[PDB]
Every structure is written in structure tokens, then in C-alpha cells.
Ligand binder design. Structure first.
Ligand SMILES: CN[C@H]1CC[C@@H](c2ccc(Cl)c(Cl)c2)c2ccccc21
Ligand SMILES: CC(C)C[C@H](N)C(=O)O
Ligand code: NA
Ligand code: NA
Length: 509
């Protein structure tokens, strides 16, 4: 089996798994939509009660599986629980990251396309005061790039440049993945993560220097870091906070598991898992939190920045921020640095959610790395045409896989590992080879608090929030549902073929 070459390489690869578009795009919107500082209390609590324990659990499951030559959940769930239903539940650890990759790589491709155009100065020119007259050219720039519907039909028409850039983006992901774990993912992480850190710090400093008649960057930080204790009774803020915690730490995606399956049997995962998690949070709350929100608040004020965040998932990062930057000397180049930052952040993450499918094909169907990588990319590339051409297909995939899917799968993986496999066996497995030990209290958090926390969340989620969606959406949602259900059945069939290939080999050997 492939293994991580160095300790630092492992940490940076895992940090690259976690530190992505979620830190710089998702977090600021989620925080601003939910009261800034009011979002942060449930966010911190979710990190301590969910983020941390599940990170350790997933590293542990991965290392355990990898020792026996298995990096993905269909096999790993079965090793922990010898039941046919374990294999089927394990399919979600291939389905979730695959579906997520299908739109995530597309969003990542926009950041590359924007980086190129901003570098070359092929950007909108606003008039040389009126906020609408500045923002509109940038809105139109994004809308023409992805091809937002101009009529009634839910049809997207991406520009030719956007389509070619998606192809280049797929190629770049392949070029890293094809070289493998140590010489591909690990080697790239060692270059990408320092670059990402430096670019982000530079942007934080530049943003901190922003002052207008409407406010300062400090007003943005005060908005994000001032608690509101009245919002603690609102379940929506809690649901948002936990959803971000899962997304940002790559939990419930089978991705941490697969990466950890290349950690050697003896090698620590307690300190390594905690460091990767802590590096992500710093990149999220300190770096991601200090760019978009403070800049928007400085130029528009709090109320207008909140409205901007509520307008959509991509307004703040793809429209508002570059528009703000264009009002400063060298602002176009600053836009480039922002989008290059986003691209490297996305790239280190997208390779992480393509690796589970790669590992499955290698581990279970015995494909070569080359064939496993090329077939995974072919599936992601083909499937992304749905996200590229059908309006709100991205939304539907992100709802089922990237939102509901991960929380369900987090609860599922915990029950299988910490309840069925055995709490004391799981606790032993986590701590084995640890440089530091997991604090004793976390045994009771993992066994009782975390599963109860997630179960209550999922019940309130399903009853008081999601029936409003399943009924009040456009009929075209069924196209995406139909296709991603098909992918699940496709992956179930491959799991079937893998266990039949095992029987043929077990009969021969
Ligand atoms: C629950 N889904 C929401 C919030 C997350 C948000 C989202 C999802 C994935 C990513 Cl990568 C980002 Cl940056 C942001 C989004 C995007 C488009 C449509 C809907 C949504
Ligand atoms: C799907 C995951 C790889 C996402 C990543 N953790 C991010 O924050 O962008
Ligand atoms: Na990343
Ligand atoms: Na993240």
C-alpha cells in the first residue's frame, strides 16, 4: 500500500483536504446570514462536540482499514460490522464525495477562469460612486461566465472559456492524482499550503487597510466576533453551524477516512488529526473570516453586507469582493490573488474527494492507479455537465450529498465504529500509536453526546425545515435526484462486483 512519506507532508495534505472553498466562500456567507457573532457560539460548540471527535474517529477508521488494504467505507464498514447492510451504508462514502466533486470541481474551475481573466486584465470596467453602477458590471461578468438563465427555462449556458477552463481544471486534478499519494497529493500539498497561507495573509492585511465613509474592516470583525445570546434559542443557527463544521473539516465525505488509510499502522493520528483540524479552523475563522466580511462591511456597512450574503452563495466572493477591490489601486491584481488563492484552496480539496473513488477502484476492483484516476475523472467530468447546464442542479446535489448526506454519514460512521464495533475497541484503536492521548472526557462525548447531538439535529432538520423544500421546488430537481440516485445504484453494483471478484480470488488462492 501507498503511504505518506513524511509527517509534515501528511499534515499539510490533510490540511489541504480541509482548507478549501468552505473556508473562504462558504464560511463568510453562513456566518453573515446567521448574525455574525451569533453564529460563532454554536460554531465553536459544534467544533468541540462534533468536529474534533469525528475527525479522530475518521482518522482511526482510515488507518485501521488501510492496515488491511482497504481505504473506503464499503469495505471498512464491513470490517467493523460483518453485515451486508454495512457494505450498502458504506456506499455513501463513495457516493457523497463523488457527487460533491461533481459540482465542487466546477466551482473550483470558476476561480481558475477568474484568476486568468483578472491576471490578463480582461475584467469589467466600472464608471470612474453609485454602488449599483460598480456592482452590476461584476454581476454581469459572473452571469455571462456561468450562463445564468435570462428567461423562463432552467437552462445554463456557460461561456466557451468557462467550459475549456473546466477541462483544464479536470486535467490539473488528474495530473496530481495520477502521480499518487506521496509524489502527487503530498508533494503538491507542500507547495500549495504555504502559497495559500501567504496569499491569504496578504489579503487580510490589504483588507484591514480599507476605510470608507461607510465603515472600516474593524466594523466587520466586530460584527463577526460580537456574541448574540438571543440567537442561541434559534435552531436554524445551530443547524447552519454544524453543517459548516462538517463541510469545512471534510467530515462525512469519506475523504478523511481514505487519506488516513495511507497512514502507517503505527503512526500517530491523535496529534496529527488535531493539528489538521486546528490548522483548518485558523484558516477559517482568522483568514477566511477576515477577508470577505470586513471588506464588505467597510464599503457598505453591516446591514448591506448581510443582505449581500443572503442574496446567494457566490455573490460575496465572485461579485462583491472583486467590485470592492476594483475601487483600489492595483485592485485587478488583488482580484487575481484572491481567485488564485481560491483555486489552490479548491484544488487541494477536490483531489481529496476524488481519491475515495480512486481508492475503491484500486483496493477493491484492483485497477492500476492510472486507470482508477482516469475513470474517476471521466465519471466526474461527464456528470458535471448536469451541474454546468441545468439551473439549480448544483443546489440539489449540495443539499443531498454536501449537507444532509454528511451529517447522516457522520452519525452512521460513529454508530458503526463506537457502538457496534465496540466503544472500548474504538477508543483503543484511536489512541494506539498516539503521541498524545485523547482527553478522557471525549470517550463520553464520542459514545453519548455526539450521536445524541446529531440525532436531535437531524430530527429537527427533517421535520421543521426540509418539507418546505421537497414540495416548493421546480420540477427539474427530479432530473438531478434521478441522476444521483442512479450514481448510488451504479456504485452499489460496483460493490457487488468487488465482493464477487473476492469470491473468485478466494476460491483460487
Ligand atoms: C445548502 N446549500 C447552499 C449553502 C452552501 C452553498 C455552497 C455549497 C458548496 C460550496 Cl463549495 C460553497 Cl463555496 C457554497 C450553496 C451553493 C449553491 C447553492 C446552495 C448552497
Ligand atoms: C468537500 C470538502 C473537501 C470541502 C472542504 N473541506 C472545504 O472546506 O472546502
Ligand atoms: Na483545499
Ligand atoms: Na475547510
Amino acid at each position: 500500500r501507498e503511504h505518506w512519506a513524511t509527517r509534515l507532508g501528511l499534515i499539510l495534505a490533510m490540511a489541504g483536504n480541509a482548507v478549501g472553498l468552505g473556508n473562504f466562500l462558504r464560511f463568510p456567507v453562513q456566518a453573515a446570514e446567521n448574525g455574525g457573532g451569533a453564529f460563532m457560539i454554536p460554531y465553536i460548540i459544534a467544533f468541540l462536540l462534533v468536529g474534533i471527535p469525528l475527525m479522530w474517529i475518521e482518522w482511526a477508521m482510515g488507518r485501521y482499514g488501510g492496515a488491511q488494504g482497504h481505504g473506503t467505507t464499503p469495505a471498512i464498514f464491513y470490517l467493523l460490522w460483518r453485515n451486508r447492510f454495512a457494505k450498502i451504508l458504506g456506499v455513501f462514502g463513495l457516493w457523497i464525495p463523488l457527487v460533491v466533486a461533481i459540482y465542487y470541481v466546477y466551482i473550483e474551475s470558476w476561480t481558475l477562469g477568474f484568476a486568468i481573466k483578472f491576471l490578463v486584465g480582461l475584467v469589467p470596467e466600472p464608471p470612474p460612486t453609485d454602488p449599483d453602477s460598480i456592482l452590476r458590471p461584476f454581476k454581469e461578468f459572473l452571469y455571462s461566465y456561468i450562463g445564468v438563465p435570462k428567461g423562463d427555462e432552467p437552462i445554463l449556458k456557460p461561456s466557451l472559456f468557462a467550459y475549456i477552463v473546466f477541462l483544464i481544471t479536470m486535467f490539473i486534478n488528474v495530473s496530481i492524482l495520477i502521480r499518487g499519494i506521496s509524489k502527487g497529493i503530498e508533494r503538491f500539498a507542500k507547495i500549495a499550503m504555504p502559497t495559500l497561507f501567504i496569499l491569504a495573509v496578504f489579503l487580510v492585511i490589504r483588507v484591514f487597510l480599507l476605510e470608507t465613509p461607510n465603515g472600516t474592516a474593524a466594523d466587520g470583525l466586530n460584527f463577526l466576533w460580537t456574541p448574540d445570546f438571543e440567537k442561541l434559542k434559534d435552531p436554524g443557527v445551530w443547524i447552519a453551524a454544524v453543517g459548516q463544521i462538517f463541510f469545512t473539516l471534510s467530515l462525512g465525505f469519506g475523504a478523511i477516512i481514505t487519506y488516513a488509510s495511507y497512514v502507517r499502522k503505527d503512526q500517530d493520528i491523535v496529534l496529527s488529526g488535531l493539528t489538521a483540524a486546528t490548522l483548518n479552523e485558523k484558516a477559517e475563522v482568522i483568514l477566511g473570516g477576515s477577508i470577505s466580511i470586513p471588506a464588505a462591511v467597510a464599503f457598505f456597512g453591516v446591514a448591506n453586507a448581510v443582505a449581500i450574503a443572503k442574496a446567494g452563495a457566490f455573490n460575496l466572493g465572485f461579485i462583491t469582493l472583486p467590485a470592492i477591490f476594483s475601487q483600489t489601486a492595483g485592485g485587478t491584481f488583488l482580484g487575481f490573488l484572491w481567485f488564485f488563492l481560491l483555486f489552490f484552496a479548491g484544488l487541494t480539496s477536490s483531489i481529496a474527494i476524488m481519491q475515495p473513488m480512486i481508492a475503491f477502484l484500486e483496493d477493491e476492483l484492483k485497477l492500476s492507479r492510472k486507470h482508477a484516476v482516469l475513470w474517476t475523472a471521466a465519471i466526474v467530468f461527464f456528470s458535471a455537465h448536469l451541474v454546468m447546464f441545468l439551473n439549480k442542479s448544483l443546489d440539489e446535489m449540495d443539499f443531498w450529498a454536501g449537507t444532509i448526506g454528511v451529517v447522516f454519514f457522520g452519525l452512521t460512521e460513529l454508530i458503526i465504529f463506537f457502538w457496534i464495533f465496540g466503544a472500548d475497541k474504538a477508543w483503543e484503536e484511536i489512541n494506539r500509536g498516539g503521541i498524545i492521548k485523547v482527553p478522557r472526557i471525549y470517550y463520553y462525548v464520542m459514545r453519548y453526546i455526539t450521536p445524541a447531538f446529531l440525532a436531535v439535529l437531524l430530527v429537527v432538520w427533517a421535520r421543521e425545515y426540509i418539507p418546505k423544500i421537497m414540495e416548493e421546488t421546480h420540477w427539474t430537481v427530479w432530473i438531478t435526484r434521478f441522476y444521483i440516485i442512479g450514481l448510488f445504484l451504479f456504485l452499489t453494483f460496483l460493490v457487488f462486483l468487488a465482493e464477487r471478484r473476492r469470491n473468485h480470488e478466494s476460491a483460487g488462492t
